Amino acid sequence: MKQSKVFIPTMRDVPSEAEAQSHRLLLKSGLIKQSTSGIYSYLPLATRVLNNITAIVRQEMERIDSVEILMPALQQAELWEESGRWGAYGPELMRLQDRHGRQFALGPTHEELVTSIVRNELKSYKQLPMTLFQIQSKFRDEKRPRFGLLRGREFIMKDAYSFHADEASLDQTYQDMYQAYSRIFERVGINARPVVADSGAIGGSHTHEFMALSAIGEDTIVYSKESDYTANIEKAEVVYEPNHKHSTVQPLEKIETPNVKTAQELADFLGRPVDEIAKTMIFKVDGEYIMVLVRGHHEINDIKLKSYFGTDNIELATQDEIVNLVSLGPVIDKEIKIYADNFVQDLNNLVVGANEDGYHLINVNVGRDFNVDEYGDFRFILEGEKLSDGSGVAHFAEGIEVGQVFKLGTKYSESMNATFLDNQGKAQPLIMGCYGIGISRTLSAIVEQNHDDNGIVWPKSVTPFDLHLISINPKKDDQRELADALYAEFNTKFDVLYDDRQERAGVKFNDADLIGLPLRIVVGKRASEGIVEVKERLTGDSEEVHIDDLMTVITNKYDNLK
Amino acid sequence: MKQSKVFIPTMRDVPSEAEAQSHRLLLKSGLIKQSTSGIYSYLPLATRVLNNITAIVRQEMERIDSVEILMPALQQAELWEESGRWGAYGPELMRLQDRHGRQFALGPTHEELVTSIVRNELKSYKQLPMTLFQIQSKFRDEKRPRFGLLRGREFIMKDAYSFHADEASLDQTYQDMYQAYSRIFERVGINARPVVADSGAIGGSHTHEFMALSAIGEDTIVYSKESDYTANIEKAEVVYEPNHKHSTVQPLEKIETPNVKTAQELADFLGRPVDEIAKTMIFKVDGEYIMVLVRGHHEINDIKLKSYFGTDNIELATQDEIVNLVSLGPVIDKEIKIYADNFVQDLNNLVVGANEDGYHLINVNVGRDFNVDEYGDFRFILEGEKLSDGSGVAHFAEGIEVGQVFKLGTKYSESMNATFLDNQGKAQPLIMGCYGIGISRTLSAIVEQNHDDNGIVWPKSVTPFDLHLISINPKKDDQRELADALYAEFNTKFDVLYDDRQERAGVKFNDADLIGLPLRIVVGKRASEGIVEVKERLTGDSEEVHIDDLMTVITNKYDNLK
Ligand SMILES: Nc1ncnc2c1ncn2[C@@H]1O[C@H](COP(=O)(O)OP(=O)(O)NP(=O)(O)O)[C@@H](O)[C@H]1O
Ligand SMILES: Nc1ncnc2c1ncn2[C@@H]1O[C@H](COP(=O)(O)OP(=O)(O)NP(=O)(O)O)[C@@H](O)[C@H]1O
Ligand SMILES: O=C(C[C@@H]1CCCCN1)Cn1cnc2cc(Cl)c(F)cc2c1=O
Ligand SMILES: O=C(C[C@@H]1CCCCN1)Cn1cnc2cc(Cl)c(F)cc2c1=O
Ligand SMILES: [Mg+2]
Ligand SMILES: [Mg+2]
Ligand SMILES: [Mg+2]
Ligand SMILES: [Mg+2]
Question: Which atom in ligand 4 lies closest to the alpha carbon of residue B109?
Answer without folding.
Answer: 1
